[PDB]
Design a protein around this ligand. Structure first.
Ligand code: CA
Ligand code: CA
Ligand code: CA
Ligand code: CA
Ligand code: ZN
Lengths: 608, 270
């Protein structure tokens, strides 16, 4: 104390004089600054940063929301977290992670069913309460032995109680947009939300915990997404909010989930009917809800697009994918689209589909089945989901990839010269192709193609390698030029907002696709004279119109929900109470918390 | 001039560099070329002279002492006892740092360079008399279990995998992971810590097969492959002080789940 004080009291009082005469005498500021500088000079800035923090007066503790973000976005348990918490608190004295109870109390403020909200007019058939959490998905389905045996499990939210929370977590992110777009913050116009709906079975979720094989089980998740929030200020509308990366796995929120085969039609309808009830109810009403102080009014638009091919083929009520009728958007038989190549439109809506099923069931013309089926263009069931039609992206690209992979395997045998080989030359061709590719481009052998493989194989390098394997020469043009046409075509739908990103390939798509068409019809007509596959009709005839109809083609895809599948399994065996009736409550709740935005706003701290 | 805190990065640097230079050269010729240490001392005095012992005490803690932040060993301990991955730990660390300003957890490389002190083959040791048929180096970590088994198409076909520590290096690491416990023991037993009597260790060894540890990959069946793990346990350390042996360390929970240390493991059958 006095020891060091008198050890250099000379220089102490001297620097006091100097700080008074020049720096005025803010001894605190100058002394601290010179110590931080003398410490930084020698590159030990850890102490510099922590000391600046402790002098600035920032508590080391964390708001419960942050530690919750950590626990949910790092897949910790509810006891491992306790381990970490108690060890940190014991080591460094002051607690840095909040306890568990204070984590749950801040968990509740984000799960759905916590805020007041009122509809105008009140939704018919929808309850008025505002405190509904995780509702049993079965919807009070009477299950007694005298009735139909039903055994699946299902959990869900309501639909309004989920939209409310999805909006009130992004309150700040919509207000910031309102500011950035030069708008008076205190505005309560009729906001309009755009919500993309999706669904896709993700079977083979079980585990042979008993080491006994041959026991499968499937599951289904019905989930939605907010994609654009728009207000009509003055004369026109403005994009108060838009989604950065729509078809990813962190911005698609689950709404219900169940353990039932995606084709078990009866159970599927029995569980998914209430959702469509609520969805049709809240399509002609307004939701009043305070949004950062003053109240605001919301209205919605629901586009159902994230449906693969099999679902949209089944629930919308068409004959299965092996039909003579191919396009879910127009009514043409493969043996007709293969001839009239690209001049179609979209003429298969949902209400048309429904009245067509009606004219099927009633059969007013007293005509036989074989021509009635043709009259009703292949509708044979009652559709129960209003879904907009549009090409998927992920599965379309994978299909095209496997498609021209098979054409490569075909061109090995050069069957155009000698046709009609048997199914052993074919296996030999496949083996030769796979070995040559593994030797040249090191493309591993795989049976079920993955998007990574699909991107790996659509390259000029690999087509040149196979072109150097194959004997003849005309095949060189007839394959390399086809492949470069395909690559010139792909981005206008692979993109996420190609309305302006690649606004040249779009305007050239007409030529870029009709040349593909003509050459497939001329130099390859030895395969495409009759049967043409479906996706090679979709990409050919519809996308240059679906773009102008909707906008993106990538953003309206199911890549997001699909990517989520993995997460399921993880949560299932790191967060579950082992009751087959809470094993879905917990999974749904954790998936909800994960897919929030008010949480990821913390995990993106280091950037900003 | 406005305030050294309101200015930009080196704004204050140029503003006060005059006084900085004069008194820093005076002080480095005073105490032989050192400014940061005496500068923090005078900072301590000139600040806590305004009745603010709090920040001075926490500063004395954080500098040349523990307190805030975590020793790399601690963060390693929690990372391995909570079965966290690597990228997960990175996420937690970076977001904690970005939020609370300070740096509580340590980075990754500063964790590898701090786990390299607990695996075998880091310490120096000397056998005497030397060990027949045993190498003498002290840099033997993981080594292949097959021990250089000729595996070509002309000899007995082998298709197993095995990894192991050398016995001596693993054993010396077991000893240098309980130095503190044996010291506390001989202290409590009223001995002298400056003692290097010939301690006698008593070890326990075990080997039990753990068959059926495969799992289905992708979406399909699995194959019944077994596995074997050879492991030991330090169990009782003693020393013969004076005329009789005195017990210096015993295991609290002998057959516990976390005091049998692995030594070798293989994907074979028993
Ligand atoms: Ca599917
Ligand atoms: Ca899928
Ligand atoms: Ca056993
Ligand atoms: Ca055994
Ligand atoms: Zn069509």
């Amino acid at each position: 104390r006095r020891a060091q004080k008198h050890r250099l009291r000379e220089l102490k009082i001297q620097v006091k004089e100097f700080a008074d005469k020049e720096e005025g005498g803010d001894v605190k500021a100058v002394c601290l600054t010179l110590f931080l500088l003398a410490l930084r000079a020698r590159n030990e800035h850890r102490q510099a940063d922590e000391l600046e923090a402790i002098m600035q007066g920032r508590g080391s503790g964390l708001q419960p929301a942050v530690c919750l973000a950590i626990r949910v976005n790092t897949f910790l348990s509810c006891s491992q977290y306790h381990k970490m918490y108690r060890t940190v608190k014991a080591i460094t004295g002051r607690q840095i992670f909040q306890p568990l109870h204070a984590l749950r109390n801040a968990e509740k403020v984000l799960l759905p069913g916590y805020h007041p909200f009122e509809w105008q007019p009140p939704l018919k058939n929808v309850s008025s309460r505002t405190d509904v959490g995780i509702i049993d998905g079965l919807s009070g389905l009477a299950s007694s032995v005298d009735e139909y045996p039903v055994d699946t499990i299902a959990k869900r939210f309501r639909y309004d109680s989920a939209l409310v929370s999805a909006l009130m977590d992004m309150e700040e992110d919509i207000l910031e947009g309102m500011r950035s777009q030069d708008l008076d913050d205190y505005l309560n116009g009729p906001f309009t939300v755009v919500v993309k709906e999706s669904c896709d079975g993700m079977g083979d979720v079980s585990e042979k915990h008993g080491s006994g094989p041959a026991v499968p089980e499937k599951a289904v998740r019905f989930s939605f997404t907010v994609m654009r929030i728009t207000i009509e200020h003055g004369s026109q509308n403005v994009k108060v909010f838009e989604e950065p990366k729509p078809n990813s796995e962190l911005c698609c929120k689950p709404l219900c989930l169940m353990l039932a085969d995606e084709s078990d039609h009866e159970t599927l309808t029995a569980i998914l009917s209430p959702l469509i009830a609520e969805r049709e109810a809240m399509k002609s009403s307004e939701l009043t809800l305070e949004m950062g102080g003053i109240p605001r009014t919301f209205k919605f638009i629901f586009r159902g697009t994230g449906y693969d091919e099999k679902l949209v083929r089944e629930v919308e009520g068409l004959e299965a994918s092996g039909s003579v009728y191919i396009c879910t958007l127009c009514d043409t038989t493969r043996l007709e689209a293969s001839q009239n190549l690209v001049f179609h439109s979209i003429t298969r809506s949902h209400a048309e589909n429904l009245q067509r099923y009606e004219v099927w069931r009633s059969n007013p013309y007293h005509e036989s089945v074989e021509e009635l089926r043709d009259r009703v263009k292949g509708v044979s069931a009652k559709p129960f989901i209003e879904t907009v039609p549009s090409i998927d992206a992920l599965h379309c690209d994978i299909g095209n990839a496997a498609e021209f992979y098979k054409i490569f395997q075909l061109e090995i045998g050069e069957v155009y010269k000698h046709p009609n080989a048997s199914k052993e030359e074919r296996k030999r061709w496949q083996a030769t192709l796979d070995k040559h590719l593994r030797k040249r481009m090191n493309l591993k052998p795989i049976m079920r193609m993955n998007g990574n493989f699909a991107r790996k194989l659509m390259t000029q390098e690999t087509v040149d390698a196979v072109c150097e394997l194959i004997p003849s020469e005309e095949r060189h043009e007839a394959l390399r030029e086809l492949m470069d046409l395909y690559l010139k075509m792909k981005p206008v739908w692979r993109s996420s907002c190609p309305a302006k990103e690649c606004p040249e390939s779009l305007c050239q798509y007409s030529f870029n696709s009709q040349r593909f068409a003509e050459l497939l019809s001329t130099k390859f007509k030895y395969r495409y004279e009759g049967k043409i596959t479906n996706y090679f009709h979709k990409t050919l005839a519809h996308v240059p119109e679906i773009i102008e109809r909707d906008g993106s083609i990538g953003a309206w895809a199911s890549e997001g929900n699909q990517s989520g599948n993995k997460l399921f399994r993880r949560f299932r065996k790191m967060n579950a109470r082992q009751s087959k009736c809470y094993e879905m409550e917990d999974v749904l709740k954790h998936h909800w918390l994960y897919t929030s935005k008010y949480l990821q706003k913390f995990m993106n701290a280091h950037n900003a | 001039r406005q305030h050294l805190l309101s200015l930009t990065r080196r704004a204050q640097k140029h503003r006060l560099r005059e006084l900085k230079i004069q008194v820093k050269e005076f002080a480095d010729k005073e105490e032989g070329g050192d400014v940061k240490a005496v500068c923090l001392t005078l900072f301590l005095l000139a600040l806590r002279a305004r009745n603010e012992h709090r920040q001075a005490d926490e500063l004395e803690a954080i500098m040349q002492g523990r307190g805030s932040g975590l020793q790399p060993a601690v963060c390693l301990a929690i990372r391995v006892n909570t079965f966290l991955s690597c990228s997960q730990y990175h996420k937690m660390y970076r977001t904690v740092k970005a939020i609370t300003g300070r740096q509580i957890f340590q980075p990754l490389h500063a964790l590898r360079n701090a786990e390299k002190v607990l695996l075998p083959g880091y310490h120096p040791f000397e056998w005497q008399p030397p060990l027949k048929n045993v190498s003498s180096r002290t840099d033997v970590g993981i080594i292949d279990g097959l021990s250089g088994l000729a595996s070509s198409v002309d000899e007995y076909p082998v298709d197993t995998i095995a990894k192991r520590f050398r016995y001596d290096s693993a054993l010396v690491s077991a000893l240098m992971d309980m130095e503190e416990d044996i010291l506390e023991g001989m202290r409590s037993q009223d001995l002298d810590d400056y003692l290097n009597g010939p301690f006698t260790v008593v070890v326990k060894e075990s080997c039990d097969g753990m068959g059926d540890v495969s799992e289905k990959h992708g979406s399909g069946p699995a194959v019944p492959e077994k596995a074997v793990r050879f492991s030991f346990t330090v169990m009782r350390i003693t020393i013969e002080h004076g005329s009789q042996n005195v017990k210096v360390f015993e295991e609290p929970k002998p057959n516990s789940e976390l005091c049998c240390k692995p030594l070798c493991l293989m994907l074979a059958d028993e």
